[PDB]
Design an enzyme around this catalytic site. Structure first.
Site, PDB file in Angstrom:
ATOM      1  CG  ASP A 143      -2.176   1.011   1.115  1.00  0.00           C
ATOM      2  OD1 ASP A 143      -2.334   1.704   0.078  1.00  0.00           O
ATOM      3  OD2 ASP A 143      -2.883   1.143   2.133  1.00  0.00           O
ATOM      4  NE  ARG A 147      -3.907   5.820   1.547  1.00  0.00           N
ATOM      5  CZ  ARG A 147      -4.071   5.713   0.230  1.00  0.00           C
ATOM      6  NH1 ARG A 147      -4.258   6.796  -0.513  1.00  0.00           N
ATOM      7  NH2 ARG A 147      -4.055   4.524  -0.350  1.00  0.00           N
ATOM      8  CG  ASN A 148      -0.129   4.305   3.854  1.00  0.00           C
ATOM      9  OD1 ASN A 148      -0.818   4.537   4.853  1.00  0.00           O
ATOM     10  ND2 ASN A 148      -0.647   3.761   2.750  1.00  0.00           N
ATOM     11  CG  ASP A 161       0.590   1.431   8.490  1.00  0.00           C
ATOM     12  OD1 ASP A 161       0.768   0.931   9.643  1.00  0.00           O
ATOM     13  OD2 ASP A 161      -0.183   2.380   8.267  1.00  0.00           O
TER      14      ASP A 161
END
Ligand SMILES: *c1ccc([N+](=O)[O-])c(Nc2ncc(C(F)(F)F)cc2Cl)n1
Length: 267
Positions: A143, A147-148, A161
């Site tokens: 992913d 945003r990560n 993450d």
């Protein structure tokens, strides 16, 4: 179930919990004393992952594996690192690095003029250095998105993450065949580059999620961001080749992004 690791156990009384950062599962801000063992009275701001009381045995098992994967992966400048753990006489605490400026998408969006090229090339370059490291530890992100990616006080990019659906970031083999590879994270990296050069723009603007797979199959890719140089766009397009073996590796992306960084810094 939860043994005592000498390499990672941190005293819970040297951890002063604060305000929540995210989740509803929980990530809370805290002040930790002695995260640097040479100066043990010195405090640092840390992020503490813990479960909510309505969490299951499965949730604990998952938080444990995330902590266990983090130990295995080892430290890197461009990843959110494991600082310590609190496993006994209380809730499990997985203590990680805190990034004071939040996520990259938010960092870029709050600084849109109504941030310079060396800063954007430096975000992109660092994310590639971080992804190259994760790949060398046999880690598939699955992913990768702005945003990560978290941003520290010193503008250090830290990938989080690593241990509805984000359709617009997924490589075709991941969306359809459900196969996740290092090359599929390179596709997501191409989307991440576009997010950076649009100052946190939404991928495929105006195109609904349902109409996406057909456009991709027809050979259509996003157009060049308004004031993005073709070297960077060429890299984005390379990241989006349908064939995984035709996309660059994270090693090539680091070499290519380093060249753009010296080009933007020399003159
Ligand atoms: C340190 C100080 C402030 C903030 N903040 O205001 O968002 C953060 N943010 C933060 N750091 C680390 C994580 C992660 F590692 F747990 F993912 C999340 C967040 Cl929101 N850190």
């Amino acid at each position: 179930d939860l043994p005592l690791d000498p390499l990672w156990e941190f005293p819970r009384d040297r951890l002063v919990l604060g305000k929540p950062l995210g989740e509803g599962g929980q990530v809370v801000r805290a002040e930790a004393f002695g995260m640097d063992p040479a100066r043990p009275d010195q405090a640092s701001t840390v992020a503490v992952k813990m479960l909510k009381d309505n969490a299951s045995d499965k949730d604990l098992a998952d938080l444990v594996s995330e902590m266990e994967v983090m130990k295995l992966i080892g430290r890197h400048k461009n990843i959110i690192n494991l600082l310590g753990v609190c496993t006994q006489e209380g809730p499990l605490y997985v203590i990680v690095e805190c990034a004071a400026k939040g996520n990259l998408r938010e960092f870029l969006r709050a600084r849109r003029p109504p941030l310079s090229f060396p800063v954007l090339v430096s975000c992109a370059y660092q994310v590639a250095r971080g992804m190259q490291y994760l790949e060398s530890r046999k880690c598939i992100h699955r992913d990768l998105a702005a945003r990560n990616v978290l941003v520290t006080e010193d503008n250090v990019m830290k990938i989080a993450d690593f241990g509805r659906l984000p359709v617009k970031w997924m490589a075709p083999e991941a969306l359809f065949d459900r196969v996740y590879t290092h090359q599929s994270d390179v596709w997501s990296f191409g989307i991440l580059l576009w997010e950076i050069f649009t100052l946190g723009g939404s991928p495929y603007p105006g195109i609904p999620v349902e109409e996406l797979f057909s456009l991709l199959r027809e050979g259509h890719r996003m157009d060049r961001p308004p004031h993005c140089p073709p070297e960077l766009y060429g890299l984005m397009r390379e990241c989006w080749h349908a064939a995984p073996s035709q996309r660059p590796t994270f090693k090539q992306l680091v070499e290519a992004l380093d060249k753009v960084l010296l080009a933007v810094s020399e003159e």
